[PDB]
Chain A
Amino acid sequence: MEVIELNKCTSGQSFEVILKPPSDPSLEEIQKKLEAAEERRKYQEAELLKHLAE
């Protein structure tokens, strides 16, 4: 039961008590993922317009 690093100021204080000792995607690849999905929406809407054309 030890109290280390006791810091006291005007608005409070802070300390530590030990009971027992122990024992990314680049900006290029995010635009590809986005555009890759925008491309799959374009293709899907095409098959819908092609369907409606028929």
Chain B
Amino acid sequence: MRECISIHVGQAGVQIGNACWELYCLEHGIQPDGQMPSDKTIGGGDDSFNTFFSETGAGKHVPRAVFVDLEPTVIDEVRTGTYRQLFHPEQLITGKEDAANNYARGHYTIGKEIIDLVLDRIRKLADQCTGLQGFLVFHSFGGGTGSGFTSLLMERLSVDYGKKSKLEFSIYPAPQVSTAVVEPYNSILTTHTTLEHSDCAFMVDNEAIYDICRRNLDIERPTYTNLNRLISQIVSSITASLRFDGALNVDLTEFQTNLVPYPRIHFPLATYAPVISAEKAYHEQLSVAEITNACFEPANQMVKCDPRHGKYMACCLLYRGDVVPKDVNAAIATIKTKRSIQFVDWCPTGFKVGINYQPPTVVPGGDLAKVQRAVCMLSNTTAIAEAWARLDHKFDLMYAKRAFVHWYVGEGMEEGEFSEAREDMAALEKDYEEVGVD
């Protein structure tokens, strides 16, 4: 067994962290007081769930998580929420005033004065791991903390934890659920300094999460709660292989091996189905072929884009519920004949499949309905580069006039770092086009 330390940075990271650990405890049968009746080894053991939880002599199962926020308001809910008993104070680190949506402020100005404290708290969790695998970092692109402090934390983790893998769960900026205007600057800034420090990163576009909530759940105007509960279903499906008995994606290293042949192209697209409204009368349970067939519809992708006009480098199919290998192959055959799945010529045209019999657990009273079988597809598509083009374009509209640039230079950043980060994205977009287009 080997441990996995989760790090949540900024508001979006902290709240999404709540939606996940809330779900993890419901899946592993852990109560808010941290007790687990099904665990027979008291205060010890190297089970599969022990990769995300530690155990005390009193039988408490404590997450391997560190919540960092430059403002205490969002973390303070955690100190008093329903799962307050799970964590201890050392795990929750809060500053006094945030980063004002300013990458420079989170990276340089404020970040310098709290980075050694985080590392010390993170080091305190590493000293409990008998074989640390790496870190999962949850954060937003647009936040000044999510972007500015994350990229600094990654630069240091790569120093203090060289051979350890680092996965990201990033939130792509969407205008519908954000009042910030400089999120393009922050996103492109953090992607530049973070690129060489992350082995694999899953991007979620709030625009995608938003319309899934309005379209499938009939939430006219979703809240952050509705968005996070859904986002944790996807995150639970991706991390499940690490928390349950299995053979596919058994440790963080297997994520880069199975999903990223080329280093800089480590942004897999994620697709999920089915998402059914709990307020619904009663839905006809979908077959293994109908849910699998949905993984190739733009509607339920974590980032709106057209995979038809890209090229796949890898592909995983994670199933949960009543599913067997016989049904998976049958569905796949029917799709290759109808769809347009263009693989790159230097990668095998195949799919790795992982089935977990326990169906997706749902938060009581949540928006999602209980299903008997669900799947989440991870696919490395050049089509996701569309997201970069969108964001790079917005960046270019503001930088041409140098709008808002002074807020960053005023916190110690050099104006050159902009064009430096932008030239990097330009090369990133180029690498994508070199791999997909003819």
Contact = CB atoms under 8 A, between A and B. Distances in A.
A–B contact with Cβ pairs below 8 Å: the answer is yes
Interface of A: 1, 3, 5-7, 9-27, 30, 34, 36-41, 44
A20 B329 contact: no
Contacts of B355: 12-14
A18 B350 CA distance: 4
Contacts of B345: 22-23
Contacts, number: 109
B411 to A, nearest CB: 7
Contact of B346 (A10, A18, A20, A22): A22
30 contacts: A7-B248, A11-B244, A11-B245, A12-B358, A13-B325, A13-B355, A14-B247, A14-B352, A14-B353, A15-B325, A15-B352, A15-B353, A16-B350, A16-B351, A17-B351, A17-B352, A18-B348, A19-B350, A19-B351, A20-B343, A20-B349, A23-B346, A24-B159, A34-B111, A37-B109, A37-B412, A39-B412, A40-B414, A41-B410, A41-B411
A13 B329 CA distance: 14
A1 B329 contact: yes
B2 interface: no
B407 interface: no
Interface residues of B, number: 44
B158 interface: yes
Given A6-B325, A38-B112, A24 B332 contact: no
A37 B108 contact: yes
A37 B108 CA distance: 7
Contacts of A41: 109, 410-412
B435 interface: no
Which interface residue of A10, A14, A25, A37 has the most chain B CB atoms within 10 A?
A: A14
A10 B112 CA distance: 48
Contacts of A10: 245
Contacts of A3: 325, 329
Contacts of A5: 247
A28 B233 CA distance: 41
B197 interface: yes
A18 B272 CA distance: 22
B159 A26 contact: yes
Contacts of B90: none
Contacts of B346: 22-23
Interface string B339-363: 0000101111111111111100000
Contacts of B104: 37
B197 A24 contact: yes
B155 interface: yes
A1 B333 contact: yes
Given A13-B325, A14-B354, A41-B411, A21 B245 contact: no
